[PDB]
Amino acid sequence: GSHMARIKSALDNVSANVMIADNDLNIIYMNRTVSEMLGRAEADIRKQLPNFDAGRLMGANIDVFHKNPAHQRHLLANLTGVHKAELNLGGRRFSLDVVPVFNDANERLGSAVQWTDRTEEHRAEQEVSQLVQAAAAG
Template identity: 30%
Template sequence: MKTQTAFPANNLMGVSQPDLKGNGQGGIFNKAVKLFTVAEKENGSLIDQLSGMRASLDKLQMNVFIADKDLNLIYMNEIAYSTLKAIEPEIQKAFGLRVDDLLGGSIHRFHKDPQAVEVILRNPSSLPHQAELEFGNVVLRSSINGIFDTQGQPLGYVVNG
């Protein structure tokens, strides 16, 4: 029987979708996504803009991961790092990866069918997408959303849970 891994009390994978009206932590999260979209269009790469928002994202009390348009993991906030460190033995057993080696690598290292994942991610109408990742005795629930430019082209992806 699979069990959900225990996370800090204020940081369960599977928390509700952030507030889309700009209230509370979800509001900060959604404002960051909007800022990334505008900044990408006006000023350069997503990773450059992420550095300006890092302090805010690091303090959110939810797991936040960001992948670039090529589906490489480029950011995880402090809570996400702590959450993954708590289940690192299971991650190593299932995927042969250390948490400290995740940044810069493809998100597909966790997927049985990368092509099916890309079909979902590349289609703006399928986002946000709710997903579960099961391995060992761990079940991680998350919400994935895209960051798209004004022409609908992907700039990156945000995962929270």
Template identity: 25%
Template sequence: MVQQIDPVITDTLDCLEENIFIIDLEYKVSWMNQSAQSFIDNIKTFLKLEKAEDLIGTSISRFHKNPSYQINLLEKGDFPIDMQLNLFNRFVARLVVKEFIVTGEKKGYLLNWRDITEIEKEKEKTQALIDELSAPILQTIAENTLLVPLVGELSIERMERLTSKLLNECLKNQADFVLLDFSGVTTLADSNLGQEVQKLTSAVELMGATVLYCGFSTEMVKDMVDLGIQTNQLSFVSFHNAIRYVVAKLGYRLEKA
């Protein structure tokens, strides 16, 4: 296969800083440019290769947990194919595949392998920071009372992370009351979110704390009714009303400054 490729083509591909592979019609790696070879050399241990050149002749199915799905995409012929793979629970790769056609004849496929591991790690860090800022857990003037002001669009993933974090904070602060403030929530479009909020509530109450809701807007109440979300939890129009209730329950035991 390699010998049949015009040297002008391979020389051109070698000049590119992208990781380019040529895949033959049997879905095996038949050639790679210098950039790709250097890249494979850096991860050869994970690929169980002694050297990058050993990748030649290897089926691309080894890089996908569902090889038949990958082959079906190539046979379907809807190019370019753009996919993202997690490899060895360590690397994140973006693969772009196009047909490799020479003088009107299909010789195989051109695969561009971009390592986006660091980009994805930065995205995860950014998302974690956004989640931290959009769902802080704050102490209040009332003793052993925590406030959770929810901001932005609620998602099941966010609620699951918040539950874990909140349980730790309840234990750390020996919380008697937890106020969930929904006044900053912009979107509630999934009926399953009601179940997640209830799960959070039940988990916190198993820790011995009473959960109070506050800050529901009229729009959010309508959304909850439309989605069939029901709750028997004690609710207040605002945080101000909720904290007054807590202070009264505590017998005006205010937290020392």
């Protein structure tokens, strides 16, 4: 359907990482920003997920990527509003934001995930964290 055209228009060049999987968890869209970023980080990511091929991403099922794919599968299948969480990707830390997406006829197209790098914030936290616990007890 032409939902796909509207999507490319609105997101293709926006500043955010954006990716969409269908109801089968098949990647059916990814914007330029996220495409560039996953390109660079491929080797680093491969250390974590040996199967990750950046160039083989469209069409891909994202189960491969998930520790227990059954868990996202359920999660997604019930998502109603936004889900907020974090992931490690290639030793970098991202906040992830997932929302379901629907066509004009309110059918569910799938799920939109948006990744925001927060590696620095996250390392800082780790520091302050151990620094505090070190101080509290020599």
